[PDB]
């Protein structure tokens, strides 16, 4: 019922090899729809979903302008973080940003996000009250004090509660066929002896959207949390997702094990048994 919009940006400094590389991508829920790459020839925000290609030329000009300004801002922020942490200009460093919003089935604002990571660890994040910041260390507390004095958080609220919500609502309508559908998992299981004493049972979920899913193995009704091999949900490449969960079972006892699949596209949770 609820939906999200997120932009993810990465700036990576390359000492001796030019200005930092900046990459930004936009998602609605689990569907990517735009990208920008500062090393690419075009220097334009580019469509990555069929339904965003309806947007007119003023959209692409304006979004290009915004993402280019971000690339220059975080270029500067890398140099500032370098100074706050007392680091040399010899090494390569990473600054990541995520921002966007969650909306309810209502369509109305639920949450907004505006957060940074430096070299893979939290730097500063906007708290849920959209009035205050959470800073990860003493370096980020410098930025926190400066941003509190300048009321940076307040000046983000129009975007987070207005533009973001409005844009998300427009994408969900324009991409309705894609973004508002639910593809349930197609499920199956495989069975491989690994000895004459044990066998692997693997529970598969294929072709599903959105990416959220739960696969769990039970033995005689008891969850087998610490004996299950569970892979990270992975993209099929066609906009749907895959996952599997496996357990090693004593040969001849396959029938005590059940795989349980929950997904928003299933009216009913599934139970699979070999």
């Amino acid at each position: 019922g609820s939906h999200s919009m997120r932009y993810f940006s990465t700036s990576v400094s390359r000492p001796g090899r030019g200005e930092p590389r900046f990459i930004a991508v936009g998602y609605v829920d689990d569907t990517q729809f735009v990208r920008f790459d500062s090393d690419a020839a075009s220097q334009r925000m580019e469509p990555r979903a069929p339904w965003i290609e309806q947007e007119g030329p003023e959209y692409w000009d304006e979004e290009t302008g915004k993402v280019k300004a971000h690339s220059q801002t975080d270029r500067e922020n890398l140099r500032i973080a370098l100074r706050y942490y007392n680091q040399s200009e010899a090494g390569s460093h990473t600054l990541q940003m995520m921002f966007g919003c969650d909306v309810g089935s209502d369509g109305r604002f639920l949450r907004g996000y505006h957060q940074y990571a430096y070299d893979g660890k939290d730097y500063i994040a906007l708290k849920e009250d959209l009035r205050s910041w959470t800073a990860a260390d003493m370096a980020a507390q410098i930025t926190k004090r400066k941003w509190e004095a300048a009321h940076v958080a307040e000046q983000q609220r129009a975007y987070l509660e207005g533009t973001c919500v409005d844009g998300l609502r427009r994408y969900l309508e324009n991409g309705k066929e894609t973004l508002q559908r639910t593809d349930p998992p197609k499920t199956h299981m495989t069975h491989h002896p690994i000895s004459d004493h044990e066998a692997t049972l693997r529970c598969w979920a294929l072709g599903f959207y959105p990416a959220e899913i739960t696969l769990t193995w039970q033995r005689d009704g008891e969850d087998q949390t610490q004996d299950t091999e569970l892979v990270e949900t992975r993209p099929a490449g066609d906009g749907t997702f895959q996952k599997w969960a496996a357990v090693v079972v004593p040969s001849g006892e396959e029938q005590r094990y059940t795989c349980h699949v929950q997904h928003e596209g299933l009216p009913k949770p599934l139970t699979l048994r070999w």
Partner: peptide, 9 residues
Amino acid sequence: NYNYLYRLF
């Protein structure tokens, strides 16, 4: 829709 991001650390 992207945001306008100009604020520095």
